[PDB]
């Protein structure tokens, strides 16, 4: 699914991301769309063999399992495809563990780059909330 912006929002709001370890909810709306462009359905293979899946791009070498990443982890237990649904559940509850391992929202690249240090209320501005 190709979510739209205030869409992705409100189902990630009602996921209870905003805020979450003081990540105010434009940071998240941020970091998806420069991950994946608001599409659930987005992969991404890594230099190193790993797979990156869904909205928020989370990686198969230590988060999920693909059956394809020799030697990896999946400290979210669970299949990577969970990571490509329509419903964000799997997505939101992989992506809340991450940001708690202590690096905070740098584990995201696009983050970082492009969203760091930005006015990110921007994402969620005109949406009903
Ligand atoms: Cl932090
Ligand atoms: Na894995």
Not at 64 to 71: A, S
Not at 99 to 127: E, F, H, L, P
Request: hydrophobic share 35%; charged share 20%.
């Amino acid at each position: 699914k190709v979510f739209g912006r205030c869409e992705l929002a409100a189902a990630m709001k009602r996921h209870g991301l905003d805020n979450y370890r003081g990540y105010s909810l434009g940071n998240w709306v941020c970091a998806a769309k420069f991950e994946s462009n608001f599409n659930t359905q987005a992969t991404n293979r890594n230099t190193d063999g790993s797979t990156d899946y869904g909205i928020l791009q989370i990686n198969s070498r230590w988060w999920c399992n693909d059956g394809r990443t020799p030697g990896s982890r999946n400290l979210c237990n669970i299949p990577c495809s969970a990571l490509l649904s329509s419903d964000i559940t799997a997505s939101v509850n992989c992506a809340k563990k991450i940001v708690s391992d202590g690096n905070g929202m740098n584990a995201w690249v696009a983050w970082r780059n492009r969203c760091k240090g930005t006015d990110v209320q921007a994402w969620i501005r005109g949406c009903r909330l």
